[PDB]
Design a protein around this nucleic acid. Structure first.
Lengths: 590, 90, 175, 239, 14
DNA sequence: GATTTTATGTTTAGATCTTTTATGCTTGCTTT
DNA sequence: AAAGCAAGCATAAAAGATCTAAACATAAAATC
């Protein structure tokens, strides 16, 4: 009878139990993911800092100062990524204490009266929050009397953020900009427009006169594909985190970013779901960390972790290529663990610096079929062995046709890039001296090959040494990876795609076409009552003459009318059809 | 509204009828869609055009004048270019 | 058949709790009724937590009853202010002061006939955006995500789960 | 009680009538008087140009009265046909004086050099300045096709813009997609985001959008959807 | 398969 | 005398009844 | 045979006209 039910227990005015939060895997996941989130946050702040300082300088320069100043900011098509950015802007204007600011979201502006009251109420309550008058009384005149009641012997600016400029109704927005133009000079106003599209929307939505009484200046935050390129080059492909994605999941995430939504936050949520689905298989998956704490967890492990290590498929070739106490008595495998984990982390560090050298080599070339960005060569390299691809063959063909002097200059720029990577990133990391110790003689070999090209056939020797010294050993395919890399890679696209990409259409259709795919019938691979009516109206055209359709249902299988009307009721609950409004006892497919 | 006898109009139909004159004018070649759209909205806000009560460029509209007012304002206007007068006699 | 998939759905429950721990919001999307399974979840691990059952397929369930229920029966702060946006502002600043005041809501049918307007789903999207509160929702209609734009879908931090019994719709047509 | 508007008083009457009033007209300026208005502020603009030393040595000797009058005739030869609105002529005339003065800071003999930029300055009258997902590109393309290529031409390809139901949009999207994507939640969310960003618009059916009876209306001209078909590389003029 | 690999490698390595 | 509280008269926004119009849709005649 | 225009039609939505439920500010009295 109630539309709502409560089961409240003990509330007045960390869901999980002790048995999981005690386990190391949640502590490791929280440490690694918090390092990830802090890194991508400071990266977004450093990319935003030019625009934010330009905005604060614009507000202070208008305080240095009737047509109102206003500063549009060309935000991306998605919303929540900008929101915290705007809040930081408010903190800056409460840092220097020259402006107070009320956000003016379009939900609050159904009419001009509502817009003016939320504007005045937000200004007075922002000022009270920096340090309860009636909703019916908060007019602009009270705002003027309150501003001269307070701020005159100092002139704090009156900021009104409009995060969703597109979502506003045009009439209330033009009336609001006209009212704020009427009161500028007496009240120092600035207006910022979060235009989700382009400048044509601002020039088109604002009418002749509203544009005549406005003074707008445009700032640009970075575009979303550029933001995914920066987040992917600088965090998920940064060496110092121990958890690498497989090329399938990597391609799927950049696919969802580039094909459906420009959601940087959606990319962060998908990567957090990948981190959770990998790490939550037990404590054994929490060996995937920095090497010394990994040795402490090597000592820490129990017996279930031994079984969830040993069944991993990539351990299987390692026993193929050869120990009795290793496979049963555990502790001998525990002592063999630093060799495998150390070679694996060594392989991924060598993979990252070798990938940097390769993308620096290929990216200066014209066409770049493999790609000019590190994630592209990353997914092409982890997807399959690169030497068997046609694309590497086209790359070595166009690379073998090069002029010798541009060749030696290009490889010299690649040498400067790889040495900058060797001195500036791998060096703080543990097991970093070992990797430069491994790759540095091969860098010396390509260095001497450079010096003899400085002195035709020689480029084939350079490509052979590139394949032998780098591409075969330290740019391997995911199947060719060193064993028990399964702790450090996440190849499982199936659960992530069925738990991130939702397909209500495909789920309903695969229920109504192949019930055995769900129901696990031993016979139906006996039919469910909905499925026959679904098969029958799928056979039917647009309009449904209901009695001929009903006679087909009588033919395939009184109470038959009850099962049929029950099926059409469940069908029209699903939205597949609707009953005709022009004509009773008749249907229409939707 | 003289040729089609007081039918409702729109910015794009009048844009076609204006761009038939713009490409032969040799004084109005330089104007774009934007200045003409601002002129159209300015004609809307002085209430020389009324909406029939969608895009800003695609409302239906009605003229608010008798033709004698337009025929008189062509005469009393100061320093009208002669090419627009030859369009006025057509 | 049906009992097997129902027990397999009960096997997922601790992992659902770990998913709920990280800010995700569970969202079923099956063909059959999600009623018996969600009630089994409400009994089998939610015997103690602050559960707000919401039958959104109710013909006359206003969003205002949900707002007043949250601001009254749990937080004991009286009636909500008349505007739902000021109401969720009050619920947000009320929840800002109180860590470890965890609570769950179980919404049968987000696609319900009174919730089908975009404003109720916007109120639900602002509702689940709080770090403290967590959400478990059912879905039946084939054309529900037409009203979820990317902003409301980002605030709805979902983790979809194909939970599909072949149950007849009995409560769904009872109201 | 003074009143002020642009409308003539005859718009103002109501069904009960109004009392007496004193009508009073203010004619907008002819070109000589607009030149007199813009030339009245010659002293302020000279004292502004003195603020920003060979260039100041030529500013003090050759920004005189008749030079500014010739500049005002050279400006009202161009913009006066497009607007007579005196604040906009002031606001653009000062910037065009700022770009006009360069080859008398160095060494008519000027109408070419400024008549270049002035015909770009006309293009930015009234405006006062000082990307898309791939499948959203195909959805905006299919929205323009559903809202321009009529209700009955589409059988053979496959008054203003015409309103259209969204199943027509998904059908044209399937026909133009040539890959056949699964109908994920993200794609219908992309529909609702083109709604929220004013790339599409509603006219009816808002209460039952999930019923499919809602009427939508694509709002884009030919040039940007051609830019979309260029950045995809897929031409849209074939349909 | 885990089982055939279990028989093969606990026959081989063990 | 001051505060609080609450009982009530006033306001305001939504709900609902006309009716207009109207337009997508039915379907049906007619036509190439 | 189907394609297109047409009599109408049947619900729909758009003012709009008018009233009712919720809110809300104010008056007034109970009490400290």
């Amino acid at each position: 009878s109630k539309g709502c039910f409560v089961y409240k227990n003990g509330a007045t005015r960390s869901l999980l139990g002790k048995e999981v939060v005690q386990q190391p895997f949640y502590e490791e996941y929280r440490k690694a993911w918090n390092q990830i989130n802090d890194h991508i946050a400071d990266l977004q702040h450093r990319s935003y800092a030019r625009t934010l300082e330009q905005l604060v300088d614009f507000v202070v320069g208008q305080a240095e100062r009737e047509v109102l100043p206003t500063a549009a900011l060309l935000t991306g098509i998605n919303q929540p990524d900008h929101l915290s950015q705007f809040t930081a802007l408010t903190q800056r204007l409460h840092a220097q204490r020259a402006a107070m600011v009320c956000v003016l979201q379009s939900r609050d502006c159904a009419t001009l009266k509502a817009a003016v009251e939320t504007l005045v109420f937000g200004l007075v309550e922002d000022n009270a929050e920096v340090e309860r008058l009636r909703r019916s009384q908060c007019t602009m005149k009270q705002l003027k009397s309150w501003y001269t009641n307070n701020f005159d012997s100092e002139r704090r600016q009156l900021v009104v953020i409009l995060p969703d400029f597109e979502c506003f109704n045009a009439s209330v927005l033009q009336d609001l900009i006209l009212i704020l133009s009427a009161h500028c000079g007496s009240l120092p106003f600035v207006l910022v427009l979060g235009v989700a599209t382009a400048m044509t929307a601002v020039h088109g939505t604002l009418p002749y006169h509203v544009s005549s009484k406005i003074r707008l200046r445009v700032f640009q935050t970075q575009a979303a594909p550029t933001g995914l390129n920066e987040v992917l080059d600088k965090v998920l492909l940064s060496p110092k985190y121990a958890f690498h994605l497989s090329g399938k999941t990597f391609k799927f995430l950049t696919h969802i970013f580039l094909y459906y939504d420009f959601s940087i936050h959606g990319f962060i949520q998908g990567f957090k779901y990948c981190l959770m689905e990998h790490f939550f298989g037990g404590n054994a998956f929490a060996l995937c960390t920095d090497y010394s704490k990994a040795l402490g967890r090597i000592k820490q492990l129990t017996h279930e972790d031994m079984e969830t290590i040993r069944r991993l498929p990539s351990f299987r070739p390692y026993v193929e290529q050869i120990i009795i106490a290793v496979l049963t008595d555990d502790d001998y495998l525990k002592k063999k663990l630093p060799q495998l984990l150390r070679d694996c982390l060594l392989h991924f560090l060598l993979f990252r610096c070798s990938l940097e050298f390769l993308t620096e080599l290929v990216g200066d070339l014209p066409r770049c079929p493999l790609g000019k960005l590190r994630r592209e060569l990353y997914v092409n390299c982890l997807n399959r062995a690169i030497i068997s691809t046609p694309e590497y063959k086209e790359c070595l063909q166009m690379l073998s046709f090069l002029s010798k002097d541009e060749f030696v200059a290009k490889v010299n720029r690649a040498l400067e890039r790889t040495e900058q990577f060797l001195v500036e990133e791998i060096a703080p990391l543990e097991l970093g001296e070992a990797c430069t110790a491994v790759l540095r003689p091969k860098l010396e070999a390509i260095r001497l090959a450079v010096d003899e090209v400085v002195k035709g056939r020689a480029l084939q020797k350079t490509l052979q040494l590139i394949e032998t010294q780098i591409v075969q050993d330290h740019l391997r395919a995911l199947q060719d990876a060193p064993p028990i890399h399964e702790l450090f890679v996440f190849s499982d696209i199936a659960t992530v795609r069925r738990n991130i990409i939702g397909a209500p259409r495909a789920a309903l259709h695969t229920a109504l076409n192949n019930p055995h795919f769900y129901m696990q019938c031993k016979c139906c691979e006996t039919l469910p009552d909905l499925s026959v009516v679904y098969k029958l109206h799928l056979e039917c055209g647009r309009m449904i003459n209901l009695f001929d359709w009903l006679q087909a249902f009588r033919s395939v299988v009184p109470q038959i009318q009850a099962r049929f009307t029950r099926a059409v009721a469940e069908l029209q609950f699903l939205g597949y059809i609707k009953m005709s409004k022009r004509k009773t006892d008749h249907a229409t497919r939707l | 509204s003289q040729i089609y006898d007081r039918d409702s109009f729109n910015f794009e139909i009048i844009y076609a009828r204006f761009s038939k004159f713009a490409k032969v004018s040799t004084t109005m070649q330089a104007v774009e869609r934007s200045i003409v759209l601002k002129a159209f909205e300015h004609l809307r806000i002085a209430e020389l055009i009324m909406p029939l009560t969608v895009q800003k460029e695609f409302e239906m509209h009605k003229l608010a004048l008798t033709y004698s007012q337009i025929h008189h304002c062509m005469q009393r206007y100061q320093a009208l270019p002669t090419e627009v007068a030859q369009w006025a006699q057509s | 058949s049906i009992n097997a998939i129902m027990e397999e759905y009960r096997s997922y429950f601790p992992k659902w709790m770990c998913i709920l721990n990280e800010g995700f919001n569970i969202l079923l999307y099956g063909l059959g009724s999600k009623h018996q399974l969600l009630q089994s979840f409400h009994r089998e691990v939610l015997h103690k937590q602050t559960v707000l059952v919401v039958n959104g397929f109710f013909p006359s369930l206003t969003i205002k009853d949900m707002l007043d229920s949250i601001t009254s029966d749990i937080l004991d702060a009286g009636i909500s202010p008349a505007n739902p946006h000021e109401a969720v502002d009050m619920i947000e600043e009320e929840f800002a002061l109180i860590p470890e005041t965890h609570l769950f809501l179980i919404v049968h049918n987000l696609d319900g006939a009174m919730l089908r307007n975009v404003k109720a789903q916007a109120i639900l999207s602002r509702l689940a955006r709080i770090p403290n509160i967590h959400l478990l929702a059912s879905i039946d209609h084939i054309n529900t995500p037409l009203l979820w734009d990317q902003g409301k879908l980002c605030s709805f931090n979902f983790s979809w789960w194909d939970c599909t019994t072949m149950l007849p719709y009995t409560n769904e047509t009872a109201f | 009680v003074i009143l002020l508007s642009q409308l003539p008083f005859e718009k103002f009457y109501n069904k009960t009538g109004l009392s007496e009033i004193v009508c009073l007209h203010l004619a907008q300026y002819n070109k000589a008087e607009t030149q007199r208005i813009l030339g009245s502020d010659f002293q302020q603009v000279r004292n502004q140009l003195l603020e920003q030393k060979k260039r100041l040595e030529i500013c003090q000797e050759a920004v005189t009265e008749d030079f500014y009058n010739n500049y005002l005739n050279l400006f009202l030869s161009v913009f006066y046909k497009a607007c007579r609105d005196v604040p906009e002529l002031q606001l653009t005339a000062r910037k065009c004086l700022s770009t006009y003065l360069e080859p008398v800071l160095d060494g008519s003999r000027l109408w070419r050099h400024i008549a270049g930029p002035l015909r770009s300055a006309l293009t930015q009258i009234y405006m006062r300045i000082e990307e898309l997902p791939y499948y959203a590109k195909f959805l905006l393309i299919a929205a323009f096709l559903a809202s321009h290529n009529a209700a009955k031409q589409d059988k053979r390809l496959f008054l203003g813009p015409k309103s259209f139901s969204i199943d027509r949009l998904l059908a044209i999207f399937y026909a133009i997609l040539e890959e056949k994507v699964g109908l994920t939640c993200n794609l219908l969310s992309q529909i609702s985001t083109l709604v929220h960003l004013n790339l599409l618009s509603f006219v009816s059916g808002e209460q039952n959008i999930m019923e499919g009876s809602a009427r939508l209306q694509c709002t884009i001209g030919l040039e940007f959807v051609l830019q979309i078909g260029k950045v995809v590389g897929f031409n849209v003029r074939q349909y | 398969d885990y089982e055939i690999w279990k028989a093969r490698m606990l026959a081989k390595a063990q």
